[PDB]
């Protein structure tokens, strides 16, 4: 669609643990997105708990929480165009066992209560994570100076 | 078949992002031999030369202007299936559907600002190469690690 | 030289418009500092005034501060044993005519009014950026899975 | 499938002539396996006759005993989670013709005949090439400090 | 001060090590403009021109013969200090002097083959220059990033 | 002055610990040096205290020993002109605090009892350590095919 849509990365806890905040941005840095928003944060198990809500009744939800909150998240909101379905596509498979080399997950990640990342799968699940995570004063407005070179359209 | 050459370009927005180094890695690291390579502002005709094939779809005036918009760093690569091996190093030429781990892939968004372009055919290598460079223009040389690149041929 | 002492890393506009994002933070990572706190902000001038007091006769100050405000700023507080001292070594020198490569104003800048990147220049002036920039609620507490293998001691 | 499964992985003599030593190791490295055992070695020729046992009738066997007699072969012994198929996934195809950028072969080979590394295909064949290429005191046993960061379960 | 113009190039072992991607990023990371760059092949009398001043020394006829043993990556890179910062990027030109960080210090060993070469002084520069490269090959743009590199012309 | 100079490397178990094996075999790679040895060895606690023997009644002796025994060591022998001394400038300066960005403890370490890396500080020193780590028989005897592009003479 159009290149202002958004999605909600999240960098969990084992990613910040084992050293891999830097790597992660690069490659949406280096795909041409734009960073809105971003925070180191540890938010309460009511927050994750409300993030994972579909997720209650699944036999890995407690574990998932606790894990989630076992050290600090680096919360993101990247913008570009299609960036929901081709960010997910950069993190890789949600399973890294599934996971092709190349992508962060096949680079870096093993098992799925370990999986380094977490991005929204769809548009309205972004939304809904975006502000879930962030206040609106958060996101912040401007225009990358390589826009005319990344995008052919708005 | 190992004397096999492709043309490979970086196009405007690949020289203006900052990603000459990294694309001629790409191709460095994978065994390739580059035997031609220069920074042209071509001329409007030989660029809608290039793209004559598409002359009539609806994308070709937008086209031209925007490989018009800045330098472009063109390059023969010569190598075993360079041709084939070339594109699918580039990734699919729709970056939205091309895979993490190709150039397209880890730098493009934009089918139009795709950064790069690659020969399609080893025939339409031999006619890009021929419109883009002049034949003293590939300088013949062979790579010290040859024989560990390739087992014969 | 206690492994808790503090500084703050400053990703400015320009660092931010040329996708430093990632590289700079992979410096202070792969160094073994440990980052407590971070976020994506546009503060107001009156801090950046505040932040830049000393310099508020300088000739170039009014410049300077328009340039801090003309973009994102990826505001960072590192943790480490001399990681204020350190970490002025990795940025390399403020005028990057004579920072040394391998440094990240010798390996991305070129200017000093676009010099990508702030550090504090001493423990008692991190305290008082650290407090300037961040809320303390922002500063998260953990502690790494590698601290022994980084730390002797202290 | 726990996290003990181990495999072989060996950097074969163009691959040590072509520099791609760090690069291969870091690969497995990043991943978050655990490398148990690893010596530059140049073995007789009964040994890799006895490791490639099953080609000593096809007709690119003499040729390839010859080749990987060439030079140095880096061997390894990689431990992790499904270790055996995700190291092969990172080596990418046997012919690199059909690899995927992103992976190892994908990355650095061209030849079938020249593609710098071999991995086990299967759990059993691995512990026949460990014990075919390593005595038993050089598997090395430790533990990571990052364990329970790549690894949610045993 | 901001259009200053150095000549680099890539000597024959750095293209056969590999390496003409990392050296160029080298210079594109740094924020410096690339405007003319070609694969080249010189013949003799060029390269024994390009080192006159040299022509006395007891290295000179190897050193010529050296540079004539494989194929060249010619640039010239446009930027504030371009020609100081361009040494200091390359490093020491005894590589055993050089410090790690830069390109001598990473990749290089031996002063007859340390990989690169860039101009010494900003006269230096321009006969390098128009030795090298006519005055069509120099292409004219402007960085996306050139307000965000440089402060002021 | 010759080619052929040879001198030990080691990676301390914190390198191995965090991650580091790859990046640094990666720094003398790219250098144009030569590997003739490696393995992953766990040392006796005498050949530590034989290896660091002039350091036998120093302060931080036994705490250096133990931690030399903390975990699994990559030991090396590199082979090029002038390897001993310009190696110990690709390491850096044996404490962190005093080392350049650029080089490997610049780069990764901080503490001087957890620098990562060792190197022989002379030629002399070299072959008693080269002789003290490795048998003669695992030095791999081979030719780089870019020798001649790294070296102009013997
Ligand atoms: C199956 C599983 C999922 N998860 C996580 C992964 C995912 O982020 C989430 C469930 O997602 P899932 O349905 O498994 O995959 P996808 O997102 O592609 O539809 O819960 C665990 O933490 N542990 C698990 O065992
Ligand atoms: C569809 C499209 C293609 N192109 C260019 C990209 C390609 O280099 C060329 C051919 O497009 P296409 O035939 O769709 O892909 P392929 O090269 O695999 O056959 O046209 C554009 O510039 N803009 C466009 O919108
Ligand atoms: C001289 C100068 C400084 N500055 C800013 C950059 C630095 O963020 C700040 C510090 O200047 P300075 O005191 O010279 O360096 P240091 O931080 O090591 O004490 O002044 C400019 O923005 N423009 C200038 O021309
Ligand atoms: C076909 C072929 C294989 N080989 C090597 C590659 C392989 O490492 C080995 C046998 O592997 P192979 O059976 O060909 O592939 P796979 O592992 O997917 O079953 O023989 C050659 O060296 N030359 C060849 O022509
Ligand atoms: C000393 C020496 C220099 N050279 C080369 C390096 C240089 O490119 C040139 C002489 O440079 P040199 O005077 O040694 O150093 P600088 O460039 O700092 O003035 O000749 C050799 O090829 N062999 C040599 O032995
Ligand atoms: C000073 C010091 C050294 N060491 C170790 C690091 C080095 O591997 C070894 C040599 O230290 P040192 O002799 O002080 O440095 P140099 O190599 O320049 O002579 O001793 C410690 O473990 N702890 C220490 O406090």
Not at 48 to 77: N, R, T
Not at 90 to 101: F, H, M, R, V
């Amino acid at each position: 669609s159009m290149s202002n849509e958004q999605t909600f990365i999240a960098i969990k806890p084992d990613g910040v643990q084992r050293g891999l905040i830097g790597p992660i941005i690069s490659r949406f840095e280096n795909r041409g997105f734009k960073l809105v928003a971003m925070k180191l944060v540890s938010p309460p198990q009511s927050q994750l708990e409300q993030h994972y809500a579909d997720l209650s009744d699944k036999p890995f939800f407690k574990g998932l929480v606790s894990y989630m909150l076992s050290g600090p998240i680096c919360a993101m909101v990247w913008e570009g165009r299609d960036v929901v379905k081709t960010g997910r596509t950069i993190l890789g498979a949600t399973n890294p066992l599934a996971s092709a080399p190349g992508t962060i997950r096949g680079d870096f990640a093993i098992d799925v209560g370990r999986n380094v990342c977490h991005g929204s799968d769809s548009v309205e699940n972004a939304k809904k994570e975006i502000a879930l995570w962030f206040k609106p004063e958060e996101l912040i407005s401007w225009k990358s100076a390589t826009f005319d070179w990344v995008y052919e359209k708005a």
